[PDB]
Design a protein around this ligand. Structure first.
Ligand code: YAR
Ligand code: YAR
Ligand code: YAE
Ligand code: YAE
Ligand code: K
Ligand code: K
Ligand code: K
Ligand code: K
Lengths: 466, 466, 466, 465
């Protein structure tokens, strides 16, 4: 395990504290054994998500101070539009308040556009792996979300360079089955969050886009972690060994038609989202027509002007290779600490989190009883670290049948905010989970007390089994 | 006209600039003669809206600096929930990114809830006046938006205390014609933005609420400008002559079942919304379930934690009587400057804006040629001040008819951001408008060029008559 | 009077409060009838000083955020050094924590440098008027502080373009009387604070410098309000009618060898000072050697790095003609209000304050009973406005025999912080003071309870003389 | 060597970068081989000082935003006055722009007050050790600055609990030789910076104070690093084993009559200083009379209001035991990395810095050829880290003679700002210096090329010899 020093020093700190065991126990049962329902005051180190918890730089706070709060035509909107042209070569932007705001703007528009000629009678979206809000927006619009990640992602301890890849064979199988007239869009998620933050190769992106263009299928790049994906391409694709990160990104986005981005991840924000379209002006116009009632006027999209200003600056800092090297290396450092102690993880670690394989850690719990959630709850009670489940709990049920969706992966996700915790916090996380080696065998699954019908895991309340 | 001293001093400034006449003429042509498409760099004083353009206090910025950016369970969420319980006596909150996000959370939930009871077969919403985004959500969900503002609102020059009131007789008539089963909700807009930011009396709110409870009709207070409404109730209802603003607010919210609020208005924010529900926990659960995919997790609703921090402080400052006296008095000052010179305005002035009655100012232009917009563009080229139309352009077209909705009013809205401009800025605005006295008789309408089917006035491009 | 509109808008506000008459009564009594000892919570509008109370721009706060806090070699030190070179064409800078820090750095260095030839045996400084701290550092170093402003400044009500000018005849007469070898330095105070903020013409500065170079005398420019002086030169000198402010400043500093500066005035700051030296490297070295033990290392001089950063931006904004026109026009507006009601003031008003001639306002109180303080207290008890005395109380005792220094002017200074108050605040001050006209004749003087030996007007406690 | 985790997380970052070797060479040549003259742009990790470079907390920045900028009577002045009453039990405060401003306010007052009785005809100040500016202000007012730190501070590698203590025998011996009438003040420096940030025990402070009240001698507590001293008292004195930091602080200040403080240290600021006085109103009145011409009005003292508000918050945060345990533990960690690799240091490490004994690292470099500055220069060229010298380059020239290289200690001070650098930055520093064991044999001394007659270290020039 190699500690990689920070390419920055600390400018402002925020106090954290360890609540007592009795605090955690009470807090956990008040939360219905769902850490999502814990107040942050009951949490020590928060690894629930890497979304919106990032530490910004002094340059980003300075851009916020001068942000233009105008309702129409803010200076920062044109800065953002120029930045998107520079980074992605895309000519149209619509800001959004966050990632799922951007999907709410763009996915219904693509559905209605697909349906112009009486097509898309049984519409589907295809992705390497739709994430929760992305899949929810697909199914909310009467569509069907189809995930075709390479099965190399299901073998956690076996190394592979691109565990986020599409399965090209499955892609052509699904185009054959559903027909090109039913494929509303192909969504390229970079990195692929559900597979463990794993990168997608340039040739995979290129091949998917080529196949999509042969059949006239629109391609949207889900871009929340595009910079981490770009680093992995440079690190592992020998054709880009000597390319800058911005060069890698520029090429990535030749293989999509639009992007939806949660700017709360790689652009180092606490809020903010973005739709960008390469050249299709009709889609842009219709998406502006939906942005207005749903998010806000087209030049702020539900963002304060200061947040668009932070986004312009963050979109630069997120691409800096020295920062990416440290950030991705801190995640690798945590994973190696765990792997060197026998804890099974998705190998190699992704860009933003360590995914602990709980199928192997607590095999006496079936997936329908949420084995990873039992490990998470145990970790919290022994240390105050809050982590999140990426398995059967999160996958939800099938909108057609109503039964549990088959989860090929039961992960506890140790999600790392950008520039927030040190390697010594990592050591704390590792040692607390490593110290649980004995308790794992005697952990009990969990049963629903209250299940919402869409995105259940966010607000569900659970009870142990026996 | 009377000038009221600020109950505060200036702590931070932002430069503004007057663009040369040539720049304003180029900019407007580029903007398709729709000032919504003008960049703020081409606007001197911006009166397009009082939403999100407010100046915050130093306590609000200090609150943002210590805002808890936790994804789930931010301590600012809990402070917000205590503040709603203090101000409104409501027990449930869901933050939203702004007002139209709050509406998207609550309104489809109220429709769907009524439909599951076998009701809302031909669903309508009834309001004193739905504002544009509010009515757009009503229509998007398949319902009709009915406005029943008191007829005194159309009598522009004639003073009345409560021009935002419901017409009780039309309330009963519509309940009779559509049936209580089809009324999805009554929306009490306070102040009534579309009537000229004019107040709704306490006795009107109370009688409306009593009528609704008789029929089992849910009542929603659209609370964007609730503090401005509360001040007017104190200024004009002798029953509250010696009450605090908070006591007036506490009584107002006895007469709704929930509220949707744009926190970008009276809470003095640049971004932010809120849903609060008095005590119906079922609606709260359903709205929480719709929040998660649309806005964000239920303890931040698409806001950064700093923005929830600003909101808690802003709701306290928004209610301070000496501030409101200054704020509403600045609006009155602007209105009095114009009324002195013979410009017909909605009288008395509302809380947030002067409404210049363009039916009486420029009678030669037909209602279907948007007379108020002709005045707006003329004001912009003359002074670099940007205003907004509240007439036929805004009303758009009638659903199911594709026809211009009947516009009882043609208004140019001089919208005043909170704590941003001085009374000397007000004199500039007034002087520029007065100077066009002789050119009012020689103005013409405009023709559509690109008309959006919903909320057309935002991105529509226009062209002069000749 | 004429109100000039702000060339900016408000971005952040700070609440102020009017304390009751009963509070003012108790507060002034506890403060030893000396408003310097009032807590700010007892003041509504604070006209005590324009020093360090200014409102900064968003750009200045953005600069503070990215300030370099390094102990040696802060990035902002080199920006400040380039700024001084651009504005003044001076090659050396030493930052200081404020104006009197700069004086404590430079004046002792100028004295010992003058002594190095066996000279300065009876040392004096000559100025148009030494400000209080300036004169105190002169006297504390064993030297005499000579003031020789134009007698036009004693003709309060009579207009003159240049009431801050040196009396040239007195300059030459003091040189002949004292000998050039005794004049440690000539201090050109621009604007002349003690005369009423009144400007020094460019030809007056040029002639003073030429006389000083004729005699080998070092010339320091006390530059706290150099930007207000530069404006007045462009307004009133036909040679500079079409120059830029920066061009005027560039020429002003041709007529000095160094400057001391409180950046708490015209650079729009809350803290900060500066020494800059044109090209005498020996003085620079000796001043650097004094800086280290008194102020701090020579690249921050007792300033945080953010404050140096704010100083670089402020030095630019303070020279903007549009801001200067408004700022100086705001002071003129308050003066004309008082001048129109028959209140005698120093006319024309200067850059930063209105000086009310209390010698004429309350002719019944002798100067040793400090008549201006009588007015000040009355204005405070009536309105919560706090002003300051610029008369015999401020002038103090002579260093020999403790005799009261004969004051030629007994002023009440209404000092206006930059970009902080509106013209409606100005209206409040004027109406308060205008409303006291029936009570001026029935006012008494004051006598000492505790007199500090140096700068008594700051901590002295007074008792009314009845 | 034990890494202690942060009791906080990062809210805001500032970017740094390692200048290429050529830039470091160019920078050092242009800086005249004096790192005090390097632009920070040429510096990676700055160890020049722990003064004014600290990272503030979000509560401190929020305090700054609501700061009351009023010239007289700022709300934050009254908050600061109530804070000093709470922490120290002292009744009077005067804010100051930084520590040496506080010294300029109070020390000349103390001499004048002692003179007005007919005493202090041959005036001296006595300290466990006067810091540099402190001693400079003493000597600028015609007095002699006497240092009488325990002799255990001179045995660099031998552990002692309290290497900052007063030598009590020398204290009594100096009171006997100079006379109580000539001792203007006793200055207790906590922690004792010039000894290596080494703590003073409570019983030592108490005994110094007792001897001084017998002889009528005023006692000033130089409090730049009083929190670190309180932590060490709690760590090493069993009587305070179960006391809180604030109780230890409350007890320390029973043994002084006044304090001067650089708030740029333990109160976690970038600027700021403070004078506080226990109960002597006359000394307070005289100090105010000096504050007004030197610093500013008595309710802001040359500080912006935002900085007084920060100081009120930082005074609270600087006493937090979990923070102090982390902060002092990180310095200990750096020292242990070096000590475990054979690098001689002042042991145990102080509260704010590791001090490296360079005479043992560069033997064939004598004192007048700047042995500690040679290591520092080599270290910067090799790593871009800037450290400071506490040896014969700082010591300067004998009066009317030559190099006062009577360097009792030839130290390189690796000074650690609070809450700024991680333990992985600590590793970089240690690995860089440890990596210099090979090139130590180059033994390249340093020779002047330009020199000032006074304050040479702050701005001199030299060349390798
Ligand atoms: C053509 C004017 S532009 C639109 C912004 C604005 N009004 C917003 C309101 C909203 C929506 O809230 P938001 O999503 O936060 O904008 C709900 N209810 C009411 C009464 C409002 O006034 C205004 O300027 O009048
Ligand atoms: C009633 C409060 S007097 C203190 C502020 C004050 N002027 C200060 C001046 C200084 C010293 O500068 P600082 O140490 O930064 O205060 C030097 N020269 C000149 C012309 C000045 O005016 C004022 O209010 O006029
Ligand atoms: C606490 C766990 S759920 C918080 C969501 C967060 N991911 C968000 C996300 C979005 C929506 O972006 P946004 O609407 O801004 O959240 C879209 N696409 C992808 C690939 C994403 O990963 C995450 O993985 O932790
Ligand atoms: C390279 C050394 S530069 C000096 C700055 C710093 N120490 C300052 C200090 C002061 C002056 O305080 P201030 O005037 O605020 O600096 C007073 N007393 C003590 C015990 C101090 O340690 C330090 O040790 O680096
Ligand atoms: K957040
Ligand atoms: K905004
Ligand atoms: K100030
Ligand atoms: K600093």
């Amino acid at each position: 395990a190699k500690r990689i020093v920070e390419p920055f020093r600390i400018k402002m700190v925020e106090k954290i504290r360890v609540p007592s065991r009795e605090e955690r126990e009470a807090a956990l049962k008040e939360a219905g054994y769902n850490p999502f329902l814990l107040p942050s005051s009951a949490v020590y180190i928060d690894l629930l998500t890497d979304s919106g918890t990032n530490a910004m730089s002094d340059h980003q706070w300075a851009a916020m101070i001068t942000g233009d709060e105008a309702y129409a035509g803010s200076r920062n909107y044109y800065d953002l539009k120029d930045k998107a042209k520079e980074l992605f070569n895309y000519d149209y932007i619509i800001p959004a308040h966050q990632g799922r705001g951007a999907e709410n703007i763009l996915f219904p528009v693509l559905l209605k556009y697909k349906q112009k000629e009486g097509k898309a009678k049984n519409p589907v979206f295809i992705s390497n792996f739709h994430f929760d809000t992305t899949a929810a927006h697909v199914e909310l619009n009467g569509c069907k979300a189809i995930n075709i990640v390479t099965e190399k992602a299901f073998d956690s301890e076996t190394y592979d360079d691109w565990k986020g890849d599409f399965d090209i064979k499955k892609l052509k199988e699904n185009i054959a089955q559903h027909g090109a007239d039913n494929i509303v869009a192909i969504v390229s998620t970079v990195t692929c969050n559900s597979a463990g933050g794993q990168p997608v190769s340039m040739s995979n992106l290129k091949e998917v886009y080529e196949i999509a263009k042969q059949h006239g299928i629109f391609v949207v790049m889900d871009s929340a972690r595009f910079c981490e994906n770009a680093y992995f391409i440079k690190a592992r694709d020998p054709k880009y060994k000597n390319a800058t990160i911005k060069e890698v990104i520029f090429d990535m986005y030749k293989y999509a038609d639009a992007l939806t981005m949660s700017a709360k991840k790689d652009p180092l924000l606490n809020i903010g989202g973005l739709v960008a379209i390469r050249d299709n002006e009709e889609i842009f116009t219709l998406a502006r027509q939906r942005c207005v009632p749903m998010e806000g006027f087209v030049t702020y999209g539900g963002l304060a002007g200061r947040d668009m200003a932070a986004m312009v600056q963050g979109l630069e800092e997120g691409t800096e290779e020295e920062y990416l090297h440290y950030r991705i290396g801190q995640v690798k450092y945590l994973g190696d600490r765990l792997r060197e102690a026998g804890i099974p993880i998705q190998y190699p670690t992704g860009g933003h989190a360590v995914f602990v394989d709980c199928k192997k850690l607590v095999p006496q719990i079936p997936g329908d009883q949420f084995p990873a959630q039992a490990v998470i709850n145990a970790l919290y009670l022994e240390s105050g670290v809050r982590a999140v489940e990426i398995g059967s709990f999160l996958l939800g049920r099938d909108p057609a049948t109503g039964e549990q969706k088959h989860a090929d992966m039961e992960f506890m996700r140790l999600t790392i905010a950008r520039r927030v915790y040190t390697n010594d916090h990592m050591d704390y996380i590792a040692d607390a989970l490593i110290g649980l080696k004995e308790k794992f065998a005697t952990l009990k699954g969990l049963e629903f007390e209250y299940e919402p019908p869409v995105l259940r895991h966010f607000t569900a309340r659970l009870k142990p089994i026996e």
